[PDB]
């Protein structure tokens, strides 16, 4: 049927009573509940507006760029190691996506990934190069990981993968919720393990937070082509769009610039507000 609208306003009139919507006690933890009909005379208004843009599914329904990977296909031997790039999967590489996710403490969603490729020549001289193909392989935590672009793991006998020919539409794939827990945590107030009385008093220093517990594997991305005289540099933009999303606990959004994968602050950015000239400036 018709999607439910936001609050309509009834007509009201003057009041002289012991009922007092104007006063409350925010100490109770409750917000004030006053609406215009409680403090001013109002006219009747039918409200047909809906909160659809603001639904969480809508709010998060955008493919954000998360990371950029660099691949280089070159005949120069020192570039062999650059033919292949490994990405540690995270959403923390980009501030807009992590900031939106960090409005919530926990969330559950399925994930859509999109891979957008751009090629150019980093060299001082270009020339003919045949069309390249790229392989995106997902390597789950603990799975064998390649040492080179031409290693044995690329056979992809287990690890799922995508083969993309440059110039076609960007690949897009969907990953079902894969957290071990029943929701992904965006914060973890704890340690990966508990150091005991027989250990160093500074123990735990290096294994605190979400960073020490989550491991989502890596993206092993390589050009699959043989080297050519003219080097091709490829920029791979990895996008994420969470969908079918539920969130379980609101938080203040971060007000300051991020420093790394945790909640760490840089002193140069701990001043989030602009100054005003006066408390009385309109």
């Amino acid at each position: 049927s018709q999607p439910p609208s936001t609050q309509s306003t009834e007509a009201t009139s003057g009041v002289n009573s012991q009922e007092v919507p104007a006063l409350t006690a925010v100490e109770t933890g409750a917000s004030g509940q006053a609406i215009p009909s409680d403090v001013v005379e109002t006219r009747h208004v039918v409200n047909y507006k809906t909160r659809s843009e603001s639904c969480l599914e809508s709010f998060f329904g955008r493919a954000a760029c998360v990371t950029i990977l660099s691949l280089t296909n070159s005949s120069k031997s020192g570039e062999e190691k650059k033919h292949f790039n490994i990405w540690n999967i995270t959403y923390t590489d980009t501030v807009q996506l992590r900031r939106k996710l960090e409005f919530f403490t926990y969330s559950r969603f399925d994930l859509e990934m999109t891979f957008v490729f751009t090629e150019n020549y980093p060299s001082t001289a270009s020339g003919e190069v045949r069309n390249q193909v790229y392989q995106i392989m997902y390597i789950p935590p603990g799975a064998p990981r390649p040492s080179s672009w031409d290693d044995y793991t690329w056979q992809s006998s287990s690890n799922p993968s995508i083969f993309y020919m440059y110039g076609n539409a960007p690949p897009r794939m969907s990953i079902p919720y894969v957290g071990i827990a029943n929701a992904y945590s965006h914060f973890y107030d704890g340690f990966a393990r508990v150091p005991l009385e027989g250990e160093n008093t500074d123990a735990g220093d290096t294994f605190y937070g979400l960073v020490s517990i989550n491991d989502f594997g890596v993206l092993a991305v390589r050009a699959v082509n043989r080297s050519n005289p003219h080097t091709i540099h490829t920029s791979v933009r990895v996008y994420m769009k969470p969908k079918h999303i539920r969130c379980w606990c609101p938080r203040p959004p971060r007000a300051v610039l991020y420093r790394g994968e945790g909640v760490d602050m840089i002193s140069s950015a701990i001043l989030p507000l602009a100054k005003v000239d006066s408390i009385t400036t309109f």
């Binding site: 508990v194 005991l196 123990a203 760490d264």
Partner: protein, 265 residues
Amino acid sequence: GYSDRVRQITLGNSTITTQEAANAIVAYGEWPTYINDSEANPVDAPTEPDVSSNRFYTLESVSWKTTSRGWWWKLPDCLKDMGMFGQNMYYHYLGRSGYTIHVQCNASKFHQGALGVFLIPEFVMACNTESKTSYVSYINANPGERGGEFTNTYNPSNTDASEGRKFAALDYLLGSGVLAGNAFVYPHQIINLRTNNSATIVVPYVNSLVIDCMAKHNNWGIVILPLAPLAFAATSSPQVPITVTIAPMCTEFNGLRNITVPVHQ
């Protein structure tokens, strides 16, 4: 009839009365309950103490001075040596509990000031070094009933390994980069000295798991801030105590093993 201000909370072998509370809050509208069979993770036979761990405990008091910038606690941690709750969290690998958090602070009618009491799930705080990230020792991260304090100065050390293992507990950013003014999103109550002398918040267990390991993770933290300064006007330096009293409730444990004894100083 009954007033809203007057209340009695009874759990286990202890009772708390109050004559000046702004009701009580049940975070997210939910009470602590025991795990339903349909959601259970472990297949161990659970331990469910009835009136042992589920009693109120009083944490070491802190003082409210006009120069304090706030106080904080990690919740499971603050009760780690508290009788049976303490012993059960160390004997069992896993455990779960909700809490009743009661904060007390007396003042006369001539005093003014206000304390915001906020309960923050996953209260993750920033390290105090710019050379490392998510860096904090177990010991500094988990101070016990003593809690910690907030400051208004960020003085990280990119060279001193010892200071870097302490938290960068700024008051205005709640130690994590979020303006405190938005802290109100979390369940909270205000001990406004001209209105209340106490606050009560009922806390359900909130996690991604039905049950977790208590020696590793602090499900909730407690943050108390001087939202409005203390003043008496009959002294150059007024002082009132703040005392936090906590009871676990609907507590259960699994994974019985040798008692865990964490690194400590």
